[PDB]
Design an enzyme around this catalytic site. Structure first.
Site, PDB file in Angstrom:
ATOM      1  N   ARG A   1       0.830  -1.201   0.000  1.00  0.00           N
ATOM      2  CA  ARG A   1       0.000   0.000   0.000  1.00  0.00           C
ATOM      3  C   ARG A   1       0.868   1.255   0.000  1.00  0.00           C
ATOM      4  NH1 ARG A   1      -5.885  -0.018   2.586  1.00  0.00           N
ATOM      5  NH2 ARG A   1      -6.765   1.552   1.163  1.00  0.00           N
TER       6      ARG A   1
ATOM      7  N   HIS B   1     -10.941   0.002   0.173  1.00  0.00           N
ATOM      8  CA  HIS B   1     -11.328   0.478   1.493  1.00  0.00           C
ATOM      9  C   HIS B   1     -10.068   0.757   2.308  1.00  0.00           C
ATOM     10  CE1 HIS B   1     -12.994   0.201   5.650  1.00  0.00           C
ATOM     11  NE2 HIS B   1     -14.089   0.679   5.088  1.00  0.00           N
ATOM     12  N   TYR B   2     -10.196   1.584   3.351  1.00  0.00           N
ATOM     13  CA  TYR B   2      -8.993   1.936   4.099  1.00  0.00           C
ATOM     14  C   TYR B   2      -8.430   0.775   4.909  1.00  0.00           C
ATOM     15  CZ  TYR B   2     -11.605   2.530   8.587  1.00  0.00           C
ATOM     16  OH  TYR B   2     -12.357   2.343   9.737  1.00  0.00           O
ATOM     17  N   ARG B   3      -9.209  -0.278   5.146  1.00  0.00           N
ATOM     18  CA  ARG B   3      -8.709  -1.333   6.008  1.00  0.00           C
ATOM     19  C   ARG B   3      -7.788  -2.292   5.250  1.00  0.00           C
ATOM     20  NH1 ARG B   3     -14.153  -1.848   9.479  1.00  0.00           N
ATOM     21  NH2 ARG B   3     -13.513  -0.551  11.267  1.00  0.00           N
ATOM     22  N   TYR B   4      -7.137  -3.157   6.023  1.00  0.00           N
ATOM     23  CA  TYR B   4      -6.136  -4.097   5.541  1.00  0.00           C
ATOM     24  C   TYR B   4      -6.532  -5.495   5.981  1.00  0.00           C
ATOM     25  CZ  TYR B   4      -2.831   0.006   5.562  1.00  0.00           C
ATOM     26  OH  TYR B   4      -2.168   1.210   5.370  1.00  0.00           O
TER      27      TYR B   4
END
Ligand code: NA
EC number: 3.1.15.-
Length: 180
Positions: free
Chosen positions: A112, A127-130
């Site tokens: 990222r 989306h901002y999550r991982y």
């Protein structure tokens, strides 16, 4: 099979570990459903870089990416980062809506970082999550390390093969360390 629950898996190969100095030389994506069934594999793209950028590679990078055939593919490639983004976005739009899937892979924070710097239009699709499979690897190593002897990786640093191994690793964890 387009669904906002589908997962976007991505792996990059780079000329080194520092996004400010190094470059992306390979990208691959896979879409799974939320149950990890592989739905479609995206473009597997060796991204052209000039010799001056390849010349930043340390010994690990040089030997790894030469022995895999990636360096030769990079030298012959006629695909730039922007074209690789276009190809990858055109694929992803057929399978997952914008902004819905976390970024999925192994130590995916590093990828990222390179997306933020070199491919922000693609980074913005996630989306901002991982979903970092290595989080589960590390917790398993501490809570029941003998589980890890039941799964092995080839680790070829061919981006599509390594992301296939990431999915297989998570599939292994679901049966071996999860109860849901
Ligand atoms: Na990786």
């Amino acid at each position: 099979s387009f669904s906002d629950q589908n997962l976007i898996w991505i792996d990059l190969e780079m000329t080194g570990l520092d996004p400010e100095m190094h470059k992306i030389i390979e990208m691959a994506t896979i879409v799974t459903d939320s149950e990890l069934n592989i739905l479609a594999e995206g473009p597997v793209i060796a991204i052209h870089q000039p010799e001056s950028e390849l010349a930043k590679m340390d010994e690990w990078c040089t030997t790894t990416h030469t022995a895999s055939g990636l360096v030769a593919r990079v030298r012959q490639s006629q695909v730039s980062e922007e074209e690789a983004i276009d190809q990858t976005l055109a694929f992803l739009k057929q399978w997952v809506p914008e902004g819905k899937s976390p970024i999925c892979g192994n130590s995916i924070g590093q990828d990222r970082r390179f997306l933020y710097k070199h491919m922000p239009r693609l980074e913005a699709y996630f989306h901002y999550r991982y979903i970092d499979v290595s989080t589960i690897k590390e917790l398993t190593r501490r809570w029941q390390p003998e589980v890890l002897k039941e799964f092995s990786k080839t680790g070829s640093h061919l981006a599509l093969d390594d992301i296939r191994e990431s999915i297989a690793e998570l599939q292994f964890y679901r049966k071996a360390v999860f109860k849901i």
